[PDB]
């Protein structure tokens, strides 16, 4: 039968900004996870609940594949129980997360001399995201009691900021592509390992 289209997530030419992270719903297909765990070298391949090696033996209703770019120092926030600007305001995993987090350095793709300004993250948000919440608002952030009325100014900040990746940045400041695989258990199971 039909193979799960993981290349169509991992090998995508373009990746999303973290604030507007993409989600691919994977369904009715067969997936080998041992190939991913050997298909490339990833700087991070951490699984929670499941086992990277002992993973092709299980069945699930749907698999979600979330992907985005963040800074190298921030990959540690893509884990249950973490905090920080990314975990709090951009992409939040639940405390009970079962799934895998895969990351690799994308300096050669996502950095540019003079700064790549296409990748953004949310800097200002009044409250933390719920798990798997996606906030794509560009409303001006009101940091005082005076309404902003769509105009930037004092206490009135555009909520997104650019990473500005340059290839000469320290590794902790280089762009990393991230894929989060989430395993749904609800209904006939439709994705299984061989």
């Amino acid at each position, epitope marked *: 039968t039909n193979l799960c289209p993981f290349g169509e997530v991992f090998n995508a030419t373009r990746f999303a900004s973290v604030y507007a992270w993409n989600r691919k719903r994977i369904s009715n297909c067969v997936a080998d996870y041992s190939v991913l765990y050997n298909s490339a070298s990833f700087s991070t391949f951490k699984c929670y609940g499941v086992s990277p090696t002992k993973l092709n033996d299980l069945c699930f209703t749907n698999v979600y594949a979330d992907s985005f770019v963040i800074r190298g120092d921030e990959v540690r926030q893509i884990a249950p129980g973490q905090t920080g600007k990314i975990a709090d305001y951009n992409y939040k995993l639940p405390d009970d997360f079962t799934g895998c987090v895969i990351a690799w350095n994308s300096n050669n793709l996502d950095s540019k001399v003079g*700064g790549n300004y296409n990748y953004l993250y949310r800097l200002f948000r009044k409250s933390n995201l719920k798990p798997f919440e996606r906030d794509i608002s560009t409303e001006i952030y009101q*940091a005082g009691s005076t309404p902003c009325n769509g105009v930037e100014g004092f206490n009135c900040y555009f909520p997104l900021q650019s990473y500005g990746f340059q290839p000469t940045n320290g590794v902790g400041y280089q762009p990393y592509r991230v894929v989060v695989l989430s395993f749904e258990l609800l209904a006939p199971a439709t994705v299984c390992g061989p």
Partner: antibody
Amino acid sequence: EVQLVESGGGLIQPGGSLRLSCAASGFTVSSNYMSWVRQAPGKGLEWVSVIYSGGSTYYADSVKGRFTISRDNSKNTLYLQMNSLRAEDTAVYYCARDLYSSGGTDIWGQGTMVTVSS
Amino acid sequence: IVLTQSPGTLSLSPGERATLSCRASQSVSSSYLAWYQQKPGQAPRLLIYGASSRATGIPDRFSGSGSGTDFTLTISRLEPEDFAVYYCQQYGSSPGTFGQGTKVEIKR
């Protein structure tokens, strides 16, 4: 009329506790990144703690486990609880509002002196 | 990230140009850097954020530049009120850190 008015500094014995407070006007403390920055006599600025609008808090290693940053939205006030104080915590303590790449640390309190000594 | 300012003391006359350096131990986006002025007995005052954005009400003679590891604060024509200590700051980490300060003093 934007300002940060600090209170609570004074003399304290080593191992003692103090709480500093920072009453804000002209912006909403709970909506902002807020920081405590201290300066020992004759020395530079040491950023010791920060609190995020959503509640996350972070500390310099020099104060971890001893200092707690917090706030009260109804009083629009930032606090710093300092326990297990040591002589080297003697400094002027500033509170400040941080905007990072959207505007730097733009609002600063007037500073309050903490002296730790037996 | 350690910020190292140089020189420790800059000795100049009014009307001269001041060039203040901040070197980062780790190469970083320009958006993460800021510059502050502090006079004796006063709180620091923000001058520049994002390496080059002049803060509100700050005189035009103050300008910042740089990227990567090397950042510069320039005062194009020193005025008597500019003799003070200057601090650089990075906020790439939480909390960030400051440089150790550069003093600008009257030369005689």
